[PDB]
Design a protein around this ligand. Structure first.
Ligand code: ATP
Ligand code: ATP
Ligand code: ICS
Ligand code: CLF
Ligand code: SF4
Ligand code: FE
Ligand code: MG
Ligand code: MG
Lengths: 271, 522, 476, 271
């Protein structure tokens, strides 16, 4: 009865910030949740743990010789509201293989059983530019069953979400992973919500929520805290709580239908 | 049961009755093995032409290939330089396999090292791995040079060999003046010969690219010779012998003769002979460079022509009669020295042997395979002998090589029934030898199974194998042989004629049945 | 002397740099049979130091070349580039009976022949096409095993999905094995991965089937790979004792034997190193007990036969006694003929996970003394086992390097060395007899009474060969 | 005279957009320039070419069997002002290995003779999340010599810049690769310019320019047309000309040195 969700999207669209605030809101109402960050630069758990540097799976495995000698306790770290946090880790940019890093980290979490029979939600915060099968690790069989794409009313996010749906369709046909919704992080350009709704209808999914660009989150990110940890009476806190409620109350899971670039031409020539 | 007087190994100790009953009981009880008639009809189906049509429609499955990966050739090239160590940046299993392969072929020690990169090295890169590996190798085995190749693991992750080596030199793991040439040898591109070419190009670049300001072509009155991927020591021997008989000064770059031919005199030698670094730095000063196997020395040719400014001759491999003559004449033109009477007499002896053996050689059909240059040389030599190549297979060949061999076949009348296959494995050759039976096969030890296959269909369908090429595993000391030059042509002629005569003798050994043709004089 | 061996170790390690010397000092030990915990004397199962000429393999060798390869009715696909399957083709003498190319495929090399387009764009569709071609071209196969190589693990191909889909579609057992070479440090993790694959995809298929008739004398050999016919030589003794053997793992082994194994009464494990995981899993899931046995030399074979017979009723014990009585004169004659020529000669061993300790008793049965033994990839438990079989003040080396082994042989000066092909010619050039202990030098079998005679004959023919008296020229 | 530059940064900052408008401005000045796209999404040269993509190297290499038989003129096409455009391409997200594709495309460009056309500038457009050495190929030896990082006044943008510098220092001590400048994209955030110049002069680099957030850029990419072509009479389309002028004149090539976030935190108390 443990639900598994993956957070995908374009680089810099707000995957990690929204994911961490969402899991904080989920822990507020009281379900145990896990975060697995498949980003080599290890920023998926900064806000929850209030720490800049932690013990990722790969650096600990390098210290311990092999991944077979790693212990889950040395890499599992609790945080606010009992949320469990683990980081795949990886190399500094420009060397090695991040995708193999995600592969090995997820394989370890699955062999050394980390999904204890207490978790209600497990989120996989994925890297923005999925360029190999390793970053498609979270969405294979016996893994994340729902996928949420973070987008915005710009050509960047629209095109990236379309390509990500193109990538997902093969796993959806081969397995049982589905698109549970689209989250849009507003850049406040023009008519954002209508464009996101139009793209969701074209693909066959729904707009999960509209989270406006609020500078307060930046302030919270100043001190390694989520907005929930800040003054909870802020509007963005209520927006994140509403997003958590809607995510809990999600039923619609479809196989996405990618569109051709001409369809994006038609959508662009609509506003 | 074993008798201490006559102890039996696996054959024929497993032919005794009790072992037969044990095997039969196990087969009938626990294998759930298919009925024999099903097996016979499936084998018969595999021998047909419908199975050939299905087999040649293969697009994704490769069965029993006839090639290896690039780092094997890289190791072979690195072994041809004086006190040079083949270092492979990647996994240790690759080096173990390369060492076992070359040990089984040459029956000689083969030295090669790796950084033994693991999963953490895959995730994080092999910079520290190469620093430690270079320091350890230099400290322990004391080489004058380390030649670095790559495995597929390192080539997928984009390991920058140049940056890693420069960082290792900067941080003090190796001396700055210690030569560490490198080459990228991806195993998913080309084959072992491509790795040899890349390693030679890397060594040549390292030793010559930055010091071409005081080099004049033809200053040292020598001709560079690049042998390529060669696994017959006799070939190096014959090339050097012929060049010395002409009196031609030469520099045989990548000479692995000595390190693969060390004597058993009580001590072990890790390094022996090899091309010296002074020969490599002086290479651009030569009159010209001659490539013995040009069909896999493409990048080397590009580098030599574009940097050394040597007008490389368009010569085929010096194999057979005509191509050996062309090689000798071109070397004479380059060096200005006449061909001596000894080589003319040797050519006369080879022609005499062809004249003697033409009766038994004419019209015989051969299915052959191997490396591009070696295969095309065999095709040419067989055409000169009157033989008929019918199935020519080169797994690591390209379209241009196909066109060249097609032209060679079209020149001769003994190539009207010749087909050339590129990208096909030995299962395709098995189908071909079943559907269009040749008299013989010419290849490496991997062909023996094909022969076995044919013998299962019948004694009249058997296609014997002649072992010329790489690798030879089930025969001893055949790497000593020579295939290049007149001596190589003589050796090949003797092998082919004696194989034909031995087959005929086997066919005529039946008393009162076929012994009327069992002639003492042939 | 213990001090002499310690001084030799220190002198040998003096040449290494600081970190390499520190690492290697823990892999060289002097034996003391009174010690039951070898981790206090030696350290095992660690990554090899870079650039030191190790003789270790990779997990691909441990999985495809060791465990899965001998299974004759299967077709094994070396998923990835061309090199691995070619270097591993028919290099191991795992003997089998069958019609090759029709119902047996041990000596044949199936590969996907990866190119650059298969790396950049993937190889799942190519793998599915390959499965279709394998089915249409080899209809009599009983299953497919996809062994992964390094690029497959790097680029994250989903071979499990292809295996599941094509197995559902074609009603065939397709086993995906992730035996990429960069995983682990040696062939041992390949053994582990292969055993897990067998457990997950093959073992539990006749779990709700009662068609098989189970005699109360059902045994299975686990970890015997029929190197030159060893498994057959052991099986003849096992059946002569009255025991019915259902499965051989995995030399000359079919798929059906593997699936019928969970119905046996005893698991006779020869190679503990490569099959202990599946033995423990079978004990936990099905309750089948497993015991170790050694069939190297007459003494060990007799002890093992009595040990196996002790777990059955009196009829099997009587048949066991009859078997020893019958085979006594043969091995006594072998000893009488060969021990005089092999008495007092000293043997240095360097083999992989099991044989450095299993073949010792055979050497003592011929009057041979083992002055030093070592493993390639064995863990600490194998070392606990071998310290009680080696004599006092004897060298123990784990993951030895070429330099270390060379210097050890130069100082110790043994009469015979038993190791692999990567060191055979090195020591043959030093005027030291060498016996290939992975391939029996293309001879064998050596297991059992029938193999003891061949073992004695081979050791005699190599140690006493005249060629070792001619290396020095009379003028030098 | 052939300067080789590579544009790095975080995903979504505006590399491709900034690189394409800068190349257009340079071509308007009269400098021949070639763009090499090392992103499998294949969108680094869509504004110059007025099309989504013509023929990537990896698609053509796969269709023609191998890259050895491929020709230069087939994959590379010229756009506005003679801008000589090629793109590595790659697989759809979630499958394959795009880094090897970039490696092969760059090797092909070198061996065929792409950098022998008397070019003045060669600009490498690389993706933000450098996850392997294949995407560090543009900064190997004899490759791009000047690196410009594009980052706005964001926490993770300034942290991605630091991580990229950490990746750079490995290649900077073994070659001639140096960090040529720090281009600053905008988010219309308060006091962005002063904080960005604080980073520039605390990193040892120089702030080259600050491009404002103008809606014309998003109004020009819909018509797949560069801002120079859309309207060379606005406040923008001259900011890019100034950036081009300061790029041709930049002579500060300084090895980067990563900074500590705590001290970096002080800059927030400044703004
Ligand atoms: N609602 C918001 N208001 C303001 N800034 C935001 C908001 N959401 C995210 N951001 C900022 O956007 C930047 C990128 O967000 P984030 O780090 O979540 O990106 P990401 O997509 O997870 O990362 P990547 O794709 O690079 O792996 C950060 O500076 C973050 O603080
Ligand atoms: N100065 C600017 N003002 C307004 N919009 C801008 C500006 N710069 C870029 N944009 C818009 O932002 C987008 C630029 O995204 P772009 O793809 O160039 O980023 P990127 O850094 O290449 O991302 P990635 O690395 O993820 O591919 C375009 O939609 C463009 O119109
Ligand atoms: S499986 Fe192992 S290295 Fe136990 S990988 Fe190796 S045919 Fe050795 S010492 Mo070759 S653990 Fe078998 C072995 Fe022993 S291949 Fe053979 S001889 S008894
Ligand atoms: S450690 Fe083992 S043997 Fe090595 S690759 Fe890896 S699985 Fe295989 Fe293979 S084709 Fe050649 S031999 Fe390698 S470089 Fe790749
Ligand atoms: S693209 Fe992915 S799989 Fe390929 S090297 Fe980079 S991180 Fe590894
Ligand atoms: Fe020899
Ligand atoms: Mg993120
Ligand atoms: Mg971009």
């Amino acid at each position: 009865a443990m639900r598994q969700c993956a957070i995908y999207g374009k680089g810099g669209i707000g995957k990690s910030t929204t994911t961490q605030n969402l899991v904080a809101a989920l822990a507020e109402m009281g379900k145990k949740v896990m975060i697995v960050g498949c980003d080599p630069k290890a920023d998926s758990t900064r806000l929850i743990l209030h720490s800049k540097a932690q013990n990722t799976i790969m650096e600990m495995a390098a210290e311990a010789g092999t991944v077979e000698d790693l212990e889950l306790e040395d890499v599992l770290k609790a945080g606010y509201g009992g949320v469990k946090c683990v980081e795949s880790g990886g190399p500094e940019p420009g060397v090695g293989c991040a995708g193999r890093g995600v592969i090995t980290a997820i394989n370890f979490l699955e062999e050394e059983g980390a999904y204890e029979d207490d978790l209600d939600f497990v989120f996989y915060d994925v890297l923005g530019d999925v360029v190999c099968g390793g970053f498609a690790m979270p969405i294979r069989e016996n893994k994340a069953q729902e996928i949420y794409i973070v987008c915005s009313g710009e050509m960047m996010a629209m095109y990236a979400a379309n390509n990500i749906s193109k990538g997902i369709v093969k796993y959806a046909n081969s397995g049982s992973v589905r698109l549970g919704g689209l989250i849009c992080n507003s850049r406040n350009t023009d008519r954002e919500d209508e464009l996101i709704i139009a793209l969701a209808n074209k693909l066959g999914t729904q707009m999960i929520h509209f989270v406006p660009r609020d500078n307060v989150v930046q302030r919270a990110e100043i001190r390694r805290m989520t907005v929930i940890e800040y003054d909870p009476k802020a509007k963005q806190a209520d927006e994140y709580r509403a997003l958590a409620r809607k995510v809990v109350d999600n039923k619609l899971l479809v196989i996405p239908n990618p569109i051709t670039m001409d369809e994006l031409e038609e959508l662009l020539m609509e506003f | 049961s074993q008798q201490v007087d006559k102890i039996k190994a696996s054959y024929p100790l497993f032919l005794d009755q009790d072992y037969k009953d044990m095997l039969a009981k196990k087969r009938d009880g626990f294998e759930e093995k298919y009925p024999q008639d099903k097996i016979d009809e499936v084998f018969q189906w595999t021998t047909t032409k419908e199975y050939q049509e299905l087999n040649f429609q293969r697009e994704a499955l490769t069965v029993n290939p006839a090639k290896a990966c690039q780092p094997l050739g890289a190791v072979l090239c690195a072994l041809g330089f004086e006190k040079t160590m083949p270092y492979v940046h990647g996994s240790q299993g690759c080096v173990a396999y390369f060492r076992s392969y070359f040990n089984r072929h040459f029956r000689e020690p083969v030295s090669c090292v790796s950084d033994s990169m693991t999963e953490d090295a895959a995730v994080f890169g092999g910079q520290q791995n190469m620093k430690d590996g270079l320091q350890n190798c230099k400290a322990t085995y004391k080489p004058d040079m380390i030649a670095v190749s790559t495995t597929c693991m390192a080539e997928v992750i984009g390991d920058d060999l140049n940056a890693f080596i420069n960082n290792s030199k900067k941080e003090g793991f190796i001396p700055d003046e210690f030569p560490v040439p490198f080459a990228h040898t991806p195993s998913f591109v080309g084959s072992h010969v491509t790795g040899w070419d890349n390693m030679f190009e890397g060594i040549a670049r390292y030793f010559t690219l930055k010091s071409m300001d005081d080099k004049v072509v033809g200053s040292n009155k020598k001709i560079n010779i690049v042998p390529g991927f060669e696994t017959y020591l006799g070939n190096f021997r014959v090339i050097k012998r012929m060049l010395s008989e002409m009196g031609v000064g030469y520099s045989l770059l990548s000479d692995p003769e000595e390190v693969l031919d060390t004597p058993a005199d009580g001590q072990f030698r890790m390094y022996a002979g090899g091309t010296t670094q002074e020969e490599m730095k002086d290479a651009p000063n030569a009159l010209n460079t001659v490539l013995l196997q040009p069909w896999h020395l493409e990048k080397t040719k590009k580098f030599v022509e574009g940097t050394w400014k040597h007008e490389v001759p368009k010569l085929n491999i010096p194999m057979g009669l005509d191509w050996t003559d062309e090689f000798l004449m071109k070397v004479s033109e380059i060096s200005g020295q006449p061909i001596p009477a000894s080589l003319t007499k040797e050519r006369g002896r080879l022609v005499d042997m062809m004249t003697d053996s033409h009766t038994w050689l004419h019209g015989k059909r051969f299915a052959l395979w191997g490396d591009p240059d070696f295969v095309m040389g065999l095709v040419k030599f067989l055409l000169e002998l009157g033989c008929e190549p019918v199935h020519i297979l080169c797994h690591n060949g390209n379209k241009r090589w196909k066109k060249a061999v097609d032209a060679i076949l079209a020149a001769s009348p003994y190539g009207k029934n010749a087909t050339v296959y590129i990208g096909k494995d030995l299962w395709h050759l098995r189908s071909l030898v079943f559907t269009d039976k040749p008299d013989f096969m010419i290849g490496n030890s991997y062909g023996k199974f094909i022969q076995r296959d044919t013998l299962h269909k019948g004694k009249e369908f058997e296609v014997p194998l002649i072992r010329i090429g790489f690798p030879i595993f089930d025969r001893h000391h055949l790497h000593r042989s020579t295939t290049l030059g007149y001596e190589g042509a003589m050796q090949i002629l003797t092998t082919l004629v004696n194989s034909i005569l031995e087959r005929l003798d086997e066919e005529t050994r039946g008393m009162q049945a076929t012994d009327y043709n069992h002639d003492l004089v042939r | 002397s213990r001090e002499e061996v310690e001084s030799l170790i220190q002198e040998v390690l003096e040449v290494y740099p600081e970190k390499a010397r520190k690492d290697r000092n823990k892999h060289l030990a002097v034996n003391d049979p009174a010690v039951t915990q070898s981790k206090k004397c030696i350290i095992s199962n660690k990554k090899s130091q870079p650039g030191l000429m190790t003789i270790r393999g990779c997990a691909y060798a441990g999985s495809k070349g060791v465990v899965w390869g001998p299974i004759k009715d299967m077709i094994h696909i070396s998923h990835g580039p061309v090199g691995c399957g070619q270097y591993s083709r028919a290099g191991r003498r795992n003997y089998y009976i069958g019609t090759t190319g029709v119902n047996a495929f041990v000596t044949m090399n199936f590969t996907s022949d990866f190119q650059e387009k298969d790396i950049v764009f993937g190889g799942d569709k190519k793998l599915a096409k390959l499965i279709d071609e394998v089915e249409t071209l080899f209809p009599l196969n009983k299953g497919i095993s996809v062994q992964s190589e390094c690029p497959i693990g790097l680029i994250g191909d989903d071979i499990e999905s292809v295996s599941k889909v094509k197995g559902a579609e074609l009603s065939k057992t397709i086993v995906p094995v992730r035996c990429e070479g960069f995983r682990g440090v040696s062939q041992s993790l390949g053994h582990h991965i292969a055993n897990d694959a067998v457990r997950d995809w093959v073992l539990g298929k006749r779990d709700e089937d009662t068609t098989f008739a189970s005699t109360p004398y059902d045994v299975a050999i686990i970890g015997d790979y029929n190197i030159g016919g060893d498994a057959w030589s052991s099986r003849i003794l096992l059946e002569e004792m009255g025991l019915r053997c259902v499965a051989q793992w995995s030399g000359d082994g079919s798929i059906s034997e593997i699936e019928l194994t969970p119905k046996v009464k005893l698991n006779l494990v020869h190679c503990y190193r490569s099959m202990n995981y599946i033995s423990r899993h079978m004990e936990e899931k099905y309750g089948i007990p497993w015991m170790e046995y050694n069939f190297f030399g007459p003494t060990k074979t007799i002890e093992s036969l009595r040990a196996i017979a002790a777990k059955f009723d009196e009829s099997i014990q009587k048949k066991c006694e009859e078997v020893i009585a019958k085979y006594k004169p043969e091995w006594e004659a072998v000893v009488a003929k060969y021990r005089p020529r092999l008495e007092g000669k000293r043997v240095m061993l360097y083999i992989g996970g099991l044989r450095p300790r299993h073949v010792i008793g055979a050497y003592e049965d011929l009057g041979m003394e083992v002055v030093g033994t070592g493993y390639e990839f064995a863990h600490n438990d194998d070392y606990d086992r071998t310290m009680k079989e080696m004599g006092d003040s004897t060298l123990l080396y784990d993951d030895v390097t070429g330099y270390e082994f060379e210097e050890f042989v130069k100082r110790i000066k043994p009469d015979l060395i038993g190791s692999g092909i990567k060191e055979k010619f090195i020591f043959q050039k030093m005027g030291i007899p060498f016996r290939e202990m992975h391939s029996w030098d293309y001879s064998g079998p050596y297991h059992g009474f029938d193999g003891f005679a061949i073992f004695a004959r081979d050791m005699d023919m190599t140690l006493n060969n005249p060629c070792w008296k001619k290396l020095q020229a009379p003028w030098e």
